Design a protein around this ligand. Structure first.
Ligand code: AQI
Ligand code: AQI
Lengths: 116, 116, 116, 116
């Protein structure tokens, strides 16, 4: 699994479940073409977005719909979304976990990049 | 000063100086119009981007050029940039500090919103 | 597994491997009695610290030896360690993951608390 | 002002006001001696804890009473407190800002260290 997204909730101390996640790849004309999407599981994880053949070098964007998550919990959020943009596979294919820790007025994001 | 951006370096425990910051506002036709730009000072802060009169209700995007900051230190970081997108002033005028704390493979961002 | 500790490295974008972790429980005379210890695995995780019978209600401390980790990488750290202190099981037993995301001059820590 | 502590609330996007902070210094016999204390102001900042002359080289501990902050807002948070332990001034006098960004089940902390 070359790309996994994990989302955590810092208010409740839990996985952030049912969070919508959309992934894009930058096109040659600098626009964002859709690539994959899903919703986080009960563990806060979204697996199966891509395959190693399809996940070529490129610039990728992961947009996490944080606003809808907080609205569903009845909590006022600051951000419209949380976006993570990164160049992938520049030194060979890697396994990427993009993690985000959400609070209503703040988020943290990190990448765990491992070599299979 | 209705909008201030502050950037910190979590590796050195310092302000992140000379970081380029570009601010955009969403126009009525859903495109991103350039709104203001600048670079962080020796304190890691960027003041003077806008005025109370100009900073009307809207959806704003703050793009922080984190990649160039790390590259100038010899580091190839994970993220292309850090973007913060938020609705401003929808309950009346507020003062916003948008802060980002940078590491090569992670960042955190928070908003401090006050009512003068 | 009632208690797991996970440690990530925000500089390298990786699990933080071989990090020493010590766990204590607060004694009746308000001193910290040793409870368990280990080192993080190649996945940054430390499992098997306790059992559900032994992990009774109480105040627990997890001390993560961040300074030794950064020294082993040749990077100057700020903190002596990262400590997490929390009351456990106050509403019944839970499964706790204590996670820490490390940078040389900053860390983040969160708890993911789930009900089996 | 050689030591300043700043506390922010990631739920409301605000300073964390009236947070108690206690500072200790490690004595030659390895015990923690009380050094200074105070509470955060309306800006979330606590100034005036020490002076350049008194703030000698040593190992310092800053304990932030995060639990009482959340409890006064009706919340039972995960952590009992947030502690930050660090060696100060070992390369000569520096100015330290110790910041903490609080959520009910998570916190981040960073140090900004400057040379006047
Ligand atoms: O990114 C993080 C993370 C972010 C922070 O701000 C603070 C922190 F302690 C961890 C993370 C990544 C993972 O892969 C993961 O499993 C977990 N977890 O389970 O708790 C967390
Ligand atoms: O956003 C933060 C911040 C982010 C984190 O991950 C952890 C933390 F403790 C603070 C911040 C904001 C500010 O306005 C500010 O002055 C400072 N500071 O000087 O240190 C920091």
């Amino acid at each position: 699994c070359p790309l996994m997204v994990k989302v955590l909730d810092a208010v409740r101390g839990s996985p952030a479940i049912n969070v919508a996640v959309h992934v894009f790849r930058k096109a040659a004309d600098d626009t964002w073409e859709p690539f994959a999407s899903g919703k986080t599981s009960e563990s806060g994880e979204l697996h199966g977005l891509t395959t190693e053949e399809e996940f070529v070098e490129g610039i990728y964007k992961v947009e996490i719909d944080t606003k809808s998550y907080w609205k569903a919990l009845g909590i006022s959020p600051f951000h419209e979304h949380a976006e993570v943009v990164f160049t992938a596979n520049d030194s060979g294919p890697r396994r990427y976990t993009i993690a985000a820790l959400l609070s209503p007025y703040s988020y943290s994001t990190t990448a765990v990049v491992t070599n299979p």
